[PDB]
Amino acid sequence: KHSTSIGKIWLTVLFIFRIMILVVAAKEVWGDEQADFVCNTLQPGCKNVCYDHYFPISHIRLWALQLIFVSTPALLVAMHVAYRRHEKKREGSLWWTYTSSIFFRVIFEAAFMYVFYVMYDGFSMQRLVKCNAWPCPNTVDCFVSRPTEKTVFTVFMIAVSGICILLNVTELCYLLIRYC
Amino acid sequence: KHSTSIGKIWLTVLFIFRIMILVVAAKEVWGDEQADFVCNTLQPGCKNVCYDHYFPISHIRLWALQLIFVSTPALLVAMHVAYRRHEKKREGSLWWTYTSSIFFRVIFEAAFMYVFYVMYDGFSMQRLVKCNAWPCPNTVDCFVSRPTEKTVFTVFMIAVSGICILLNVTELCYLLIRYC
Amino acid sequence: KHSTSIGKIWLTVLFIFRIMILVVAAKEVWGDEQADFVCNTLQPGCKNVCYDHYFPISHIRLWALQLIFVSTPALLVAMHVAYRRHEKKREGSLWWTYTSSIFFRVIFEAAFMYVFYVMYDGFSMQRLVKCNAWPCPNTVDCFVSRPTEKTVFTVFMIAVSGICILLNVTELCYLLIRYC
Amino acid sequence: KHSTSIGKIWLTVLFIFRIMILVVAAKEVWGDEQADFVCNTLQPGCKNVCYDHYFPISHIRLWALQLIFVSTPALLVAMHVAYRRHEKKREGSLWWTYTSSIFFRVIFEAAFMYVFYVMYDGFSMQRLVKCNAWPCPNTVDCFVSRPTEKTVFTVFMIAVSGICILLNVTELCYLLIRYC
Amino acid sequence: KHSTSIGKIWLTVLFIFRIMILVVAAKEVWGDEQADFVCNTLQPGCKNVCYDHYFPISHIRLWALQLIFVSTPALLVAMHVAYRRHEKKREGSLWWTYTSSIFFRVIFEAAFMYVFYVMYDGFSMQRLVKCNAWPCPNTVDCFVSRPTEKTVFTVFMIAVSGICILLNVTELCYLLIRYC
Amino acid sequence: KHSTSIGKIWLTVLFIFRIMILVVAAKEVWGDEQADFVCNTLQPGCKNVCYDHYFPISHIRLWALQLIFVSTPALLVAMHVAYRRHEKKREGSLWWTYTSSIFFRVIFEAAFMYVFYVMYDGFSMQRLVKCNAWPCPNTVDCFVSRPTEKTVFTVFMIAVSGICILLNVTELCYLLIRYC
């Protein structure tokens, strides 16, 4: 509604960039994450628990959840605006919705980025994971599928999300120096 | 027709949220539920009956049935309204359809949530299931595919359904304090 | 054309209900019907003939044929009406087409329901099928994939088809008490 | 252009019927025609040549070719009409195109039906085929996937094609009793 | 722009015919070209190099490249025409673009047909290929998947391409007897 | 906005050419890149690390990233233009956006072409790769799937990208001889 140049151009383009990466290239990279997960063992069920332990949620599913979460505040505004428009036919209020929506986008973007770091150590996928969860005997060596390609796409998504955080913080800074 | 702000915004957004989770992320998590179901046994047919025993209906199929059921009352209203519109050209009556439709949505939402709890104990998927159905000899250990990721998506869908119940109860409360 | 409330609302909603069940949930339930059909034998070709014997046509293919058959009479009417409209530009006749179309819909619905019962005994799929067709030696035990989930969807489709029969019979009753 | 009731209603509906069967139900029946083709032998390459010998072209591909061939004469007319319309802006001639198009449809329909009979003996798929093509040693037993379901759909397609031939012959009879 | 009857009817219909064959029937025929390529050997890597040696590019990929290549000259004209239209608002020139576009279509059609012959000997696929490329020991027998069905579709595409060449040559003949 | 003939015709046609190659033919040439990657070894995990070592990112994913990157500058301009249009309603500036966009396209095109050369040596895929990464014992022979077909498509994409660089350099040359 009252977006700046970066609000409606550099934020909408980067959002489409993230979706395009997810659906065109990234999704099929993760297609055989479990199928080509190879563990050096003869113990039945060891592969299931080790993959589940080291990948509690896939990266692409986490990114899909993140994109769904950061697009919801914009969607809520587009229905509140279309509702107040018809209600009158039957600033101030609009300002508080647009400032909170930016605030919620920053929180959602930072929360998922924090989840990525805590759950997956850093941002580089390792070739070998060592697993001692039951029923694997002692420690079992398992090997990840396409660790390098997944690292490349992880860096792309994290870097763009970090840029989107900065582009949202500046808009909050601009809106919080005039009003207050 | 006579919806409040939460009726046409917070209820329609949450409904789209559930569909987006189901088709974009959740469905492929359950892609190999039976293909990667691994049992420690040499008995033919044991894997078929143990998977069937512990998963009488898949979670995503239950969620798809729930969404189809909770969207039907809205669909029925949108056809009754378009029918009465042309019938006159050839409140009161509309009020009773909109109050019952909300009532049926609450019952449908609560019924499926109850089915989820009774059928699947709690809301967390276990890594190991112990099965003694014929023809499995004694008790056979079987291992579930992606139990943690399925648990995460189960919590998401249950929480949103619980919120949707509250958003529907308040609208019934508002409509049942003015008329009665 | 001259449909009642149940003719254009409760019949069109149920028809869409059946299609949504078929394409969104049911079809992938039957995805691995033969792939996970497991027989306890070492005889080549035994699995092929036993599956063919017990599933001469898949449930979803029978339902797809049923929906195609019960939608043609309506499609024929919508083209006859659009043809008579332009022919004049270049009741009575329309009444006989709409009464026969309902009649054919009832026959098609009842015929497929009868085919379901005769071919598949009841409406519950069994876990074990015993097969003695050549080249299987003596009697061979075979195990069905997802028997419980298939039973659940079978009951849903049969119940809705039975309701659709009743909704079509009443319209025939209403049209056959005024004219005759 | 100058079609009768059966020309534009009963012929167009049956054509959509054939396409609907092909794409919705029939295509996935033939999905594992070679994958589940099982031969009782240890000879490498025997399965490839026996399947190729007994299925020189799949039924669904033959039906797809038939539908493409019987729809081209109508497509050619729809471009000739749109070409003569603009040419004048820049009967007799139209009659000869519409009579030949019906004639070519009958020939194409009968040619493919004749191909089906000659290539595949009758219209019922057998469970067992005996194959002695090199490099199979002596005669090798092979087993077809879903022979009964394929027979059911073969009968449907042949019966509808036979009806379409009759519906096209009558139109030729009507056009060949007035002009000649 | 200045096309004859065969230019805009018989050439556009045949082009759609080739696309329809490619996407509806032909593409799935080549679905398991390498998966069902069977060689009589125990040498790892032998199957990879023999399939690559005998199929440097798949037939459907070659046909897709042909259709893409023979469609750009028409696409280039449709953008040059829309560019000159707006440029004036801001014959002779159009004639030279339409004559060269037909010329390039003939060259592209003939080049790919020549590539098909040189690369694949004739137009019939053989059941057996004998391969001696490293690391295969001596000569290894390998067997092609669906050779007869692929031969049938190869003949269809070659015959239509030959017809399209003749339809393009006549238009060049007509355009080169009036101007010169 | 101020594009020449080559800017809006020969550059947009080549861009569509690259997308058509990628989605219609190229993507499923790379469909089984890892599935048919065959290594001569019995060491678990050896295949995973050798494929990852020699294919850090798939060619099609690199091309998809390249197309996304070289289409962003045009997308940014189309939103800046639509933003300045409405801002006035509420040359010079447009010139600097269109000149930088061409500049960024050249850099992005050259950067990815350089990445292709450095990462993959030349532009021809080899049949055999020798791999000594842990845990592979000594040096292990591995064999690539469809090396010749991938080489053919690699040459096509490199040649078109090189042409696109030249078409973009000339436009920069034309714009940098009038202004400067």
CA separation (Å) from B104 to B107, B115, B169?
5, 16, 11
Residue C164 · residue C69 · CB < 8 Å: no
Give residue for tokens 């659709």. Answer: C164
User: Which helix H or strand E contains B41, and what residues bound it?
Assistant: none
**Phi and psi for E31 in degrees, rounded to 5?**
-65, -40
- Rounded to a whole number of angstroms, the distance between the first and last alpha carbons of chain B is 20
Q: CA C53, C59, C65: angle at the middle one, nearest 5?
A: 115
CA separation (Å) from A56 to A53, A127, A156, B145, D45?
6, 17, 21, 11, 44
Distance of CA B31 to the CA centre of its chain: 18
The arrangement of strands across the sheet holding B128-131 comes to: B38-39, B140-143, B128-131
DSSP-based three-state secondary structure for B156: helix
**Phi and psi for E98 in degrees, rounded to 5?**
-75, -30
The DSSP symbol for A23 reads I
Residue F77 · residue F105 · CB < 8 Å: no
Out of F25, F29, F40, the one facing E44 most closely (by C-beta) is F40
Mutate to test the interface with F, among E36, E46, E65 (most CBs of F within 10 A): E65
List Cβ neighbours of B31 (8 Å cut-off, separation of 6 or more): none
The DSSP bridge partners found for residue D38 are: D143
List Cβ neighbours of C86 (8 Å cut-off, separation of 6 or more): none
Interhelix angle E72-89/E93-119, nearest 10 degrees = 160
> Can you tell me the distance from the alpha carbon of D42 to that of D38, in angstroms, rounded to the nearest whole number?
11
A26 → chain F, closest CA residue: F61
> Can you tell me the distance from the alpha carbon of D104 to that of D99, in angstroms, rounded to the nearest whole number?
9
- Taking Cα atoms as reference points, which of B55, B168, B69 lies closest to residue B116? B55
Residues of B in contact with A64 (CB under 8 A): 24-25
- Report DSSP letters for C70-101, one per residue: HHHHHHHHHHHHHHHHHHHH---HHHHHHHHH
Residues of C in contact with D128 (CB under 8 A): 45
Please give, rounded to a whole number of angstroms, the shortest distance from the CA of A159 to a CA of chain B: 22
Amino acid at D172: L
> Can you tell me the distance from the alpha carbon of C21 to that of B57, in angstroms, rounded to the nearest whole number?
14
CA separation (Å) from C108 to C64, C68, C111, C156, D16?
13, 10, 5, 18, 18
DSSP-based three-state secondary structure for F62: helix
Note the resolution in Å, 1 decimal: 2.3
Please give, rounded to a whole number of angstroms, the shortest distance from the CA of C25 to a CA of chain D: 15
The DSSP symbol for F119 reads H
List Cβ neighbours of D65 (8 Å cut-off, separation of 6 or more): D112, E21, E25
Q: Report cis status (omega within 30 of 0) of the bond before C135.
A: yes
Out of B13, B142, B149, the one facing A58 most closely (by C-beta) is B149
CA separation (Å) from D4 to D11, D97, D160, D171, D175?
10, 16, 19, 8, 10
Residues of C in contact with D32 (CB under 8 A): 34-35
Residue C58 · residue C33 · CB < 8 Å: yes
CA separation (Å) from C137 to C45, C47, C52, D69, F87?
11, 12, 17, 47, 83
Question: With a CB-CB cutoff of 8 Å, which residues 3-62 of chain E face chain D?
Answer: 5, 8-9, 12-13, 16-17, 20-21, 24-25, 29, 32, 36, 38-40
The DSSP symbol for A6 reads I
Query: Which residue positions of B form the known binding site for Ca(2+)?
Result: 28, 31, 33
D149 labelled ligand-binding: no
Give residue for tokens 């009741």. Answer: C91
Two structure tokens written together for C178? 């005024």
> Can you tell me the distance from the alpha carbon of D82 to that of E8, in angstroms, rounded to the nearest whole number?
11
Two structure tokens written together for C168? 């079509």
Distance of CA B176 to the CA centre of its chain: 27
The arrangement of strands across the sheet holding F128-131 comes to: F38-39, F140-143, F128-131
Q: After which residues is chain A broken (C to N over 2.5 A)?
A: 90
- Taking Cα atoms as reference points, which of C33, C29, C169 lies closest to residue C99? C169
List Cβ neighbours of B140 (8 Å cut-off, separation of 6 or more): B39, B40, B41, B43, B46, B50, B130, B131, B132
Residues of D in contact with E145 (CB under 8 A): 34, 48
Residue B87 · residue B118 · CB < 8 Å: no
The DSSP symbol for D120 reads T
Residues of D in contact with C59 (CB under 8 A): none
> Can you tell me the distance from the alpha carbon of E7 to that of E11, in angstroms, rounded to the nearest whole number?
5
The DSSP symbol for F121 reads S
Out of E61, E79, E135, the one facing F149 most closely (by C-beta) is E61
Q: After which residues is chain F broken (C to N over 2.5 A)?
A: 90
Domain ranges across chain B:
4-179
- Name all chains with 3 or more CB-CB pairs below 8 Å to chain E: D, F
> Can you tell me the distance from the alpha carbon of B48 to that of B34, in angstroms, rounded to the nearest whole number?
8
Buried b (16+ CB within 10 A) or exposed e, D5-35: ebbebbbeebbebbebbbebbbbbbbeebbe
Residue B62 · residue B115 · CB < 8 Å: yes
> Can you tell me the distance from the alpha carbon of A21 to that of A155, in angstroms, rounded to the nearest whole number?
12
Give residue for tokens 């959002």. Answer: A15
- Report DSSP letters for chain E, one per residue: ----HIIIIIHHHHHHHHHHIIIIIIHHHTTTTTTT-EES---TTHHHHHHHHH-SS-HHHHHHHHHHHTTHHHHHHHHHHHHHHHHHH---HHHHHHHHHHHHHHHHHHHHHHHHHHHTSSSS--SEEEE--TTS-S-EEEE-SSHHHHHHHHHHHHHHHHHHHHHHHHHHHHHHHH--
- Tell me the residue length of chain C: 180
> Can you tell me the distance from the alpha carbon of D126 to that of D124, in angstroms, rounded to the nearest whole number?
6
Dihedral through CA D90, CA D96, CA D98, CA D100, nearest 10? -130
Two structure tokens written together for F173? 């040359």
Contact with chain B for residue A101, Cβ under 8 A: no
CA separation (Å) from E69 to E6, E116, E123?
20, 15, 21
Query: Which residue positions of C form the known binding site for Ca(2+)?
Result: 28, 31, 33
Instruction: Name the experiment that determined this structure.
Output: cryo-EM
> Can you tell me the distance from the alpha carbon of D110 to that of D121, in angstroms, rounded to the nearest whole number?
16
B145 → chain A, closest CA residue: A48
Residue F76 · residue A13 · CB < 8 Å: yes
Please give, rounded to a whole number of angstroms, the shortest distance from the CA of D65 to a CA of chain C: 22
Two structure tokens written together for A144? 């990840």
Q: Quick one: CA dihedral D77, D79, D83, D85, positive or negative? A: positive
Out of F55, F83, F135, the one facing A9 most closely (by C-beta) is F83
E165 C-beta neighbours (distance < 10 Å), count: 15
